[PDB]
């Protein structure tokens, strides 16, 4: 069934599961033509496939060449997503294949279900959570590898850096979604918070700065404050 606030801790049990977010697969800029009509230009995108228990991220880069000569691209993007997710599962050894795939947008259910017909025992699940994975391209190193790609490419990351050496999956996931929620609501302020102090650096093999435990407490509170301020602004509350 659908994933919601009630069955939230299932994400951190030992049943392998992946989130799939397709929000950044088909990305365009909208511009005016010489004749004054509107046209789009595609830019590179990505499928965001994440194991919330381990932090392993399978970032499949979608190169603009995929779209060449194709129609109804927003619909095609959903099927390309499902094709690539299915190829990923096939590429994994049996004991690493997920038992569930949770799609962040309900429009992905039928395409993934059809692409996964060969895996009848992998459950394809929607979610009611309003997860902020669209802000993945606010993470500088992820945006950079996507935009520099010259061809289709799979790039692997751990989205939790080394946090799991010190905190649990549940807490790691709460931090990730907090950071991304903030980046989504006000990217400039979120990024200021994360980088203000120049003495706290990002390891070459990490995505986020090397905060101490106490500094993460301060960061998380600043992100909370950011998110509440922006809410008051949005609704005049």
């Amino acid at each position: 069934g659908a994933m919601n606030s009630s069955n939230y801790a299932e994400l951190f049990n030992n049943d392998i599961k992946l989130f799939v977010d397709d929000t950044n697969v088909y990305r365009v800029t909208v511009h005016k033509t010489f004749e004054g009509n509107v046209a789009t230009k595609a830019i590179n995108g990505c499928i965001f496939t994440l194991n919330p228990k381990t932090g392993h991220l399978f970032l499949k880069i979608i190169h603009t060449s995929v779209w060449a000569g194709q129609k109804r691209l927003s619909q095609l993007a959903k099927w390309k997503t499902a094709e690539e997710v299915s190829a990923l599962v096939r590429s994994l050894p049996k004991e690493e294949q997920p038992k569930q795939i949770i799609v962040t947008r309900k429009a992905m259910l039928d395409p993934l279900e059809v692409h996964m017909l060969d895996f009848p025992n992998i459950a394809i699940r929607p979610t009611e959570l309003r997860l902020p994975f669209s802000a993945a391209m606010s993470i500088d190193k992820l945006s950079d590898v996507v935009m520099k790609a010259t061809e289709p490419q799979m790039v692997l990351f751990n989205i939790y850096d080394d946090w799991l050496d010190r905190i649990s999956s549940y807490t790691a996931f709460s931090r990730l979604t907090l950071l991304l929620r903030a980046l989504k609501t006000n990217e400039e302020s979120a990024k200021m918070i994360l980088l203000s102090d120049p003495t706290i650096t990002i390891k070459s093999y990490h995505l986020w700065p090397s905060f101490t435990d106490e500094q993460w407490i301060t960061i998380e509170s600043q992100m909370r404050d950011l998110i509440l301020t922006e809410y008051g602004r949005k609704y005049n509350v």
Partner: peptide, 16 residues
């Protein structure tokens, strides 16, 4: 409509 019988491998989107 969501079965192997209905969907040729490699024509997932087209056949659905």
């Amino acid at each position: 409509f969501k079965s192997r019988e209905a969907i040729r491998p490699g024509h997932e989107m087209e056949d659905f």
